[PDB]
Design an enzyme around this catalytic site. Structure first.
Site: not given
Ligand SMILES: COc1cc2c(Nc3cc(Cl)c(OC)c(Cl)c3)c(C#N)cnc2cc1OCCCN1CCN(C)CC1
Length: 261
Positions: A14, A21, A134
Site C-alpha cells: 500500500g 504499508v 471513519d
Molecule cells: C492494502 O494492502 C494491505 C493493507 C493492510 C493493512 N493496512 C494498514 C492500514 C493502516 Cl492505516 C496501518 O497503520 C495503522 C497499517 Cl500498519 C496497515 C492492515 C492493517 N492494519 C492489515 N492488512 C493489510 C493487508 C493488505 O494487503 C493484503 C494482501 C495484499 N497482497 C495481495 C497479492 N499481491 C497483489 C501482493 C499484495
C-alpha cells in the site's frame, strides 16, 4: 534501525499520502505483519493528532476479533512506524474492486455476514466509550483460511462523551456530524457501516457532495444492482435514517433477526 533489525521487508502492499504499508516478516517469531511507514508528522498538525488518536486508541482498546490487532508503534530517523496484524484478504475496498474486475460479487448472505461482523467490532469499540468516525471499505480488512472482517485505521477514533471530531470521508459522513452535532456519534458509525455494505453490494460510487449526496442523507438508499430481500433492504434503510436516534445501536444491530446468523 529497529525496522531493519526486527523485520524483513517482503513487499510494499500500500502507498499514498498516509505513507506506505509493507508486508513484513518478524525475524524472531517468523510471523507476517503489516507495517505502515510514514514521515514523522509535523508537531501540532492534523497528521500528528491523527497518529496520536491511532496509538492512544489501543491504550483503551483491547484485543478483539473484528478489530485489526495492534502490536507496537515507534519512531526513528524522522519516520513513524506502526506494526499491525497482517490481513491476507486485503481491504474490503480492494475486494470490491476485484469483484468488479472479474465480474464476481458478494451474495446476500455474505453481505449480512459483513454487516454482522463489523457490527460486532463497532459494538466493542462503542462499549469502550469510543467511536471510529471513519468506517468505510478501505478501513475494513479481511482475513481468510474462514472469513474474518476486521476494523482498521483508528486515525479518527475519539471519545463519545468527550467529542473531539475530525470528520471522515464525506461519502460516508452522516449529515448531523457535518452539522457539528456530536451528541450521537456512535450512530454516525452505524450510518457509515450501512453505506459500506451498500458499496459491497455493488452500488455505484458514492457522491462526495451535491444533490444525490443530500438524497442519501434524506434517508434514500442508493440503487443496488442485485436482488436483496426487502427485509435486509429495510435494515440498511433505517441505518441511514435522518434521525440518528432511530438508527439502531451497534448492540441492537448484532442482535437483529435478519442478521442472525
Ligand atoms: C492494502 O494492502 C494491505 C493493507 C493492510 C493493512 N493496512 C494498514 C492500514 C493502516 Cl492505516 C496501518 O497503520 C495503522 C497499517 Cl500498519 C496497515 C492492515 C492493517 N492494519 C492489515 N492488512 C493489510 C493487508 C493488505 O494487503 C493484503 C494482501 C495484499 N497482497 C495481495 C497479492 N499481491 C497483489 C501482493 C499484495
Amino acid at each position: 534501525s529497529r525496522y531493519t533489525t526486527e523485520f524483513h521487508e517482503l513487499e510494499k502492499i500500500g502507498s499514498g499520502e498516509f505513507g506506505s504499508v509493507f508486508k513484513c516478516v518478524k525475524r524472531l517469531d517468523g510471523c507476517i505483519y503489516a507495517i505502515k511507514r510514514s514521515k514523522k508528522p509535523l508537531a501540532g498538525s492534523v497528521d500528528e493528532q491523527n497518529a496520536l488518536r491511532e496509538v492512544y486508541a489501543h491504550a483503551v482498546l483491547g484485543q478483539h476479533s473484528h478489530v485489526v490487532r495492534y502490536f507496537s508503534a515507534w519512531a526513528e530517523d524522522d519516520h513513524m512506524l506502526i506494526q499491525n496484524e497482517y490481513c491476507n484478504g486485503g481491504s474490503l475496498a480492494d475486494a470490491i474492486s476485484e469483484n468488479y474486475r472479474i465480474m464476481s460479487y458478494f451474495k446476500e448472505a455474505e453481505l449480512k455476514d459483513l454487516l454482522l461482523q463489523v457490527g460486532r467490532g463497532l459494538r466493542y469499540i462503542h462499549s469502550m466509550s469510543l467511536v471510529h468516525m471513519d468506517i468505510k471499505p478501505s478501513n475494513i480488512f479481511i482475513s481468510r483460511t474462514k472469513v474474518m472482517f476486521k476494523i482498521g485505521d483508528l486515525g479518527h477514533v475519539t471519545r463519545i462523551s468527550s467529542p473531539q471530531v475530525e470528520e471522515g470521508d464525506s461519502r460516508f459522513l452522516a449529515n448531523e456530524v457535518l452539522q457539528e452535532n456530536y451528541t450521537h456519534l456512535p450512530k454516525a458509525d452505524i450510518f457509515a457501516l450501512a453505506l459500506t455494505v451498500v458499496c459491497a453490494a455493488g452500488a455505484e460510487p458514492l457522491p462526495r457532495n451535491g444533490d444525490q449526496w443530500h438524497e442519501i442523507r434524506q434517508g434514500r438508499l442508493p440503487r443496488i444492482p442485485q436482488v436483496l430481500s426487502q427485509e435486509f433492504t429495510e435494515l440498511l434503510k433505517v441505518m441511514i435514517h435522518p434521525d440518528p436516534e432511530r438508527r439502531p445501536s451497534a448492540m441492537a444491530l448484532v442482535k437483529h433477526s435478519v442478521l442472525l446468523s
